[PDB]
Amino acid sequence: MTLKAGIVGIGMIGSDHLRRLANTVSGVEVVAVCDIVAGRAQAALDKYAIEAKDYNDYHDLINDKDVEVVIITASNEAHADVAVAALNANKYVFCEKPLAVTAADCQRVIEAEQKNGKRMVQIGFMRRYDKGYVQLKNIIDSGEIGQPLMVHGRHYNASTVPEYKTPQAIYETLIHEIDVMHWLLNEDYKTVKVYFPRQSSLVTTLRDPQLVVMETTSGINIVVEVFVNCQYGYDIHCDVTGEKGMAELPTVASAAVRKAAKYSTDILVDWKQRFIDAYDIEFQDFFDRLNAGLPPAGPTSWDGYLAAVTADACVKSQETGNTEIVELPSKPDFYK
Amino acid sequence: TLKAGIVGIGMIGSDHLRRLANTVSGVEVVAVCDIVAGRAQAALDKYAIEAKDYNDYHDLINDKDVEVVIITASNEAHADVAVAALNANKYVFCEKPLAVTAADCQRVIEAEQKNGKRMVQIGFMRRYDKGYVQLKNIIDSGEIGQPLMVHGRHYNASTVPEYKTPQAIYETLIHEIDVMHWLLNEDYKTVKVYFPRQSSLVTTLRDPQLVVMETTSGINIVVEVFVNCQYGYDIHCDVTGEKGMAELPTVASAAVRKAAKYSTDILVDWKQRFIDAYDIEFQDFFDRLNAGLPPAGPTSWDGYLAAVTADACVKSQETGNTEIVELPSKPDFYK
Amino acid sequence: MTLKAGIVGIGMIGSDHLRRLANTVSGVEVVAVCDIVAGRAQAALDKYAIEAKDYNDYHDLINDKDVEVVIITASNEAHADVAVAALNANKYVFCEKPLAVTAADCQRVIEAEQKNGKRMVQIGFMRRYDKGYVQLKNIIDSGEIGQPLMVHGRHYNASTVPEYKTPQAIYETLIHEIDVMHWLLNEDYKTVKVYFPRQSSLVTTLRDPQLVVMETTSGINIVVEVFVNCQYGYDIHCDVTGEKGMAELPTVASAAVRKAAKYSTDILVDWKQRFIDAYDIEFQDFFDRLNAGLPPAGPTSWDGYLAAVTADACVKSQETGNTEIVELPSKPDFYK
Amino acid sequence: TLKAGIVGIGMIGSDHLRRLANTVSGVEVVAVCDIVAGRAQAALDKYAIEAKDYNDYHDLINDKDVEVVIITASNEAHADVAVAALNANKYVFCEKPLAVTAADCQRVIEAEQKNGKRMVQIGFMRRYDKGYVQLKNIIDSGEIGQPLMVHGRHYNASTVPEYKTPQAIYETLIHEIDVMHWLLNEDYKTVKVYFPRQSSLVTTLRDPQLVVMETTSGINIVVEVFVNCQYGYDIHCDVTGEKGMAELPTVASAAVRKAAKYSTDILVDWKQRFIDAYDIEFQDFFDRLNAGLPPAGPTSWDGYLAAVTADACVKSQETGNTEIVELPSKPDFYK
């Protein structure tokens, strides 16, 4: 059982995923490739000795009858248009996070998806396939630590380039916690509040670090410290305090050395290494289900819409200096 | 070798009585005092300690043998006892908190200043815990750069029915209020108490509580207080600086591999956590005093600062708003 | 560039590797299969929905013109015959560990390999591909802890079936340490000694635990505790003390729980989980090199001979109660 | 209050002199003794202690004032001082080792039995370490079932030139020899010293060493000894039972994240590792005695066992074979 995939957007992760889908994920052949920049797509096909047809306009890729599944790794600005066109053409869609920046752009995709009467979209929030997050999820769902009450998270990264501004702390970075905490706790957010701790004097190009207080609808208190120029490495923390215990996300194992009065392990520096395995796992799940004839079971268009709205309210909080309210429609039955 | 009189032989009083007589060098207990008749003598008898008993503390203070006054009485007597000792020109070791109100702290401060000699230490013992001294030294060395964020936890297994919402601040968070300020060498400008969803296992107070405190330079401190966390007594203190993070250690435990689990022990009894630091704070206090030096632990000023801060905290519990911490200029006397 | 594989021996691990090779490893296609038990091979084909020629005699699998690579997952007793026949037919060989039980059988494969006059054999000692082992190796080789002097290892397993006898603690279990420590240290063994500590009163089917002292040629002292009915799970330790520090092998990351006065993480119980990833990584390296037109770079026929002779001395030490000497010829230049 | 005289005011002598006058309750130091002239008094001078200074320990022993003799003299002197003290009917706290030769241990045992009363404690202080006590409790509860294999490490950063190959046993491993025996409630039957490849940074002794010991019931004990490991002072002790493993903790340290490393401190100064066990072993001793109870620490018989086993280790270094530990029957005096 094997499925035909077209990829739109052969940028940084476009290539990566191109390599993945032809070489690592089973039940999928890449038959079509597409980038708006002239040499791009073919250049990657060349890199990997992959044979696909190459299209400059994504529309012809989606119209290509070979193409059964559309994979969206293009720039955010493009996401909604490509997704809508795929859904209107009755094709499945894996779309990288975020679904789209605006709530409204997420709504058009939801609308396109429902007209098919069939769940057909998964979003690339890969942390849900990370094995440690899966372990944490199961501890929560087992009831072992009882009802969750408080959550403490850290999302730390060694440094940023100058073009990463204050809003990207939310849009690019926090967005992961936005999605993963929601999934861990099976709750939405009612409020968000971005605090600005003392500015790092190493950092001149954005406000950093930041401290976000989020309340879920039942009142679970989430604190996430975000420090994207913490200097020492890439470091994810997630602790959940329930009524009768606490559960802690593990980190990446390292050999340990005793040397010169110090007992030490490594902390990762390259952010891409942290959830690198989950990319393959999330696609493998997606392709296993579609090939089994079942709907996707990962993050949905609705999950993408949720994240967008929550991220939006955090950014608003940055600007106004106030707690902001998260406003969301009823979860459509379609997504239940 | 200084001669001490302990005022108030209750739960902590008797332990301090045993401690000063047996574990601390450069001091001997010459008098004791409690308003519940028998109490003071019972403890004397229990530990086979010979001291002059006093029912009224004024006599204990006037006693020409008593050179140092240790205050282990109920919060209400603190300020009254402290003031008299200072007016008698005697040194004071007072258990935390300094006093019930900010104004009582002001009363001690003025009595201390009238002696024109720094003479009071407060029993905020965490500053003497070896793990906190290590964390402080790491912060001060510049290893992690300038601190910008702090995350703390003060967890306890369960509380009795009598423990009320304001006690989360007054009895429990008070320790963090003092230790964070000492760690960072700053004061607070704002406090905010958030109440996460209420634990179904607790009906006698609001629990847990999440406190967000800002220092004068904008350092952000988050502390989770969960006094019915069920699992034990657990203290966390992580400091994120500009280029590193420093983590307070916990109590070492032997580790076990069995039935598919690797585990260590978490403390249950809150009294065991900083037990060592009582002996250490006292040894320091008397080593300085015997050496002709002023006390160098928490000052009357530190206790006033903790009072004002706790108040804003309790006021935040009530109002649902961020509350401002309002302080007068620090008097040079405390510098 | 893709190579075609016949797999001889579709048993517990053969079915597993049949699956990985077909579905997980790129640059390989499985075109043929063989097992001695009627219908066993085809059952796994069916199980996994893979099309391959099914042969009853491995000779016919080897002689099959589509087979370029022979994967040997048969019973130990068959390894040498299969490997020799595959080399005799100028096909590459991947062979599960051990290469063979007897030195003389390892020699037969060595001879057949050298008759080809090129390096064609990898043995499935998968620990060398495990990420923690690779990391430990890099610390050693960088000189950070200085010259290695002493090593402490543990190979623990929760329990064994009655069929598992005293010699198997060496043949099945220690064989992994036999090979990996030699790789870590770049040395052979000059002597081995098996102590029998106090017998576990929970164990009546073999002598357990066992404690093994091995000396490398330069005098590096290696101690390995083997407890295959330790009850608590599957647990691998490896510590290297050098002249100026110590390096410790990591274990499997686990979420941690604070509950009822205990702070804890999980210990694995299923042995197959521990090095599960290293299977994929080992074949992926094997097939990449082969497709690059390069010789395999994993454990060689000589490494399989080394492990055999050393295991034999350990078993001899079990029987005699004495330290036994490891007797080896000179490493052929062919294996350097 | 019991009255103590101390024989031998060297490194440890003067430290114990400080301990017994300062932080141990129920003991007064009334006499000291060192053979190097001025030595003893200089130490009394340092810590402002009033005490009678004797050149001859016989004199110290004959004081109407001295009830307890604390022996902190060179090993060579131990048996004579102890025999004499027990002869004059005085309690003995003796630092480890009891004596180096078994014959000298036997003389102390004979002296003690002639009193028909248990009177000697030995300063194997690890038994009072809080981590070893927890380890012991875990073993004894049955959590890990019957112990079968032990792995221990005794690492030290570096040694001075005067520290020789036999000292790896007599000074260093002696501690494991005693504490494994107490943990397991068992004696040894065989010992074997392996010599791994010699550290190139060590020219003055054979280092590291790897000791395989077998208890009477066949529990196998491996101890790695590395007294020039370079990195610090590091004690490891893992006990594998029938159904689990228990691990000695180490000294808790604050943790730092910085420059791509997560790290904690390893002690460098060997004296800091069990520093608390000294106060505790003495507090136990004097408590027991003050309550009219026999000492409950390591006995003369434990010192005898340590000596015989160490001897066999040193004999194994020399001969390169496994050596047998030959033990007589434990007298009932010591049960």
Ligand SMILES: NC(=O)c1ccc[n+]([C@@H]2O[C@H](COP(=O)([O-])OP(=O)(O)OC[C@H]3O[C@@H](n4cnc5c(N)ncnc54)[C@H](O)[C@@H]3O)[C@@H](O)[C@H]2O)c1
């Ligand atoms: N951890 C993760 O899930 C992960 C990591 C990084 C990026 N992403 C997401 O993946 C997406 C791609 O990011 P990137 O970092 O690879 O960016 P990129 O700029 O490197 O790649 C974007 C590519 O899309 C192409 N493109 C834009 N519009 C197109 C259109 N109309 N038709 C065809 N191609 C078009 C661009 O030419 C470019 O090659 C982003 O949406 C990003 O948020 C996800």
Ligand SMILES: NC(=O)c1ccc[n+]([C@@H]2O[C@H](COP(=O)([O-])OP(=O)(O)OC[C@H]3O[C@@H](n4cnc5c(N)ncnc54)[C@H](O)[C@@H]3O)[C@@H](O)[C@H]2O)c1
């Ligand atoms: N970790 C710590 O630093 C710590 C721990 C426990 C208690 N404390 C503090 O120690 C103080 C005593 O607490 P406790 O738990 O022992 O309380 P307690 O109630 O057991 O003891 C107080 C005693 O003082 C006596 N007393 C009250 N007023 C007096 C007066 N006018 N004159 C003489 N005696 C008087 C009471 O009769 C009582 O016996 C409190 O301030 C408390 O906050 C600090």
Ligand SMILES: NC(=O)c1ccc[n+]([C@@H]2O[C@H](COP(=O)([O-])OP(=O)(O)OC[C@H]3O[C@@H](n4cnc5c(N)ncnc54)[C@H](O)[C@@H]3O)[C@@H](O)[C@H]2O)c1
């Ligand atoms: N971690 C590891 O690398 C690892 C793990 C398990 C097994 N192994 C090894 O892999 C090999 C197979 O082990 P297993 O547990 O799958 O054994 P198994 O008994 O489950 O399978 C062996 C199979 O080979 C077949 N066989 C025997 N002779 C044959 C022949 N002449 N032609 C075709 N098939 C023949 C048998 O019919 C049997 O099905 C062994 O060498 C074992 O040591 C390695």
Ligand SMILES: NC(=O)c1ccc[n+]([C@@H]2O[C@H](COP(=O)([O-])OP(=O)(O)OC[C@H]3O[C@@H](n4cnc5c(N)ncnc54)[C@H](O)[C@@H]3O)[C@@H](O)[C@H]2O)c1
């Ligand atoms: N961790 C421990 O339990 C520990 C640590 C250090 C030393 N020790 C033991 O403590 C003892 C003393 O050790 P140290 O390092 O202080 O050595 P040291 O050499 O500094 O002290 C020995 C002292 O005793 C004196 N002395 C020798 N013979 C004497 C005699 N006949 N009469 C009176 N005094 C005599 C010496 O002059 C010297 O002052 C040793 O037995 C040693 O093994 C134990």
Ligand SMILES: [K+]
């Ligand atoms: K906005």
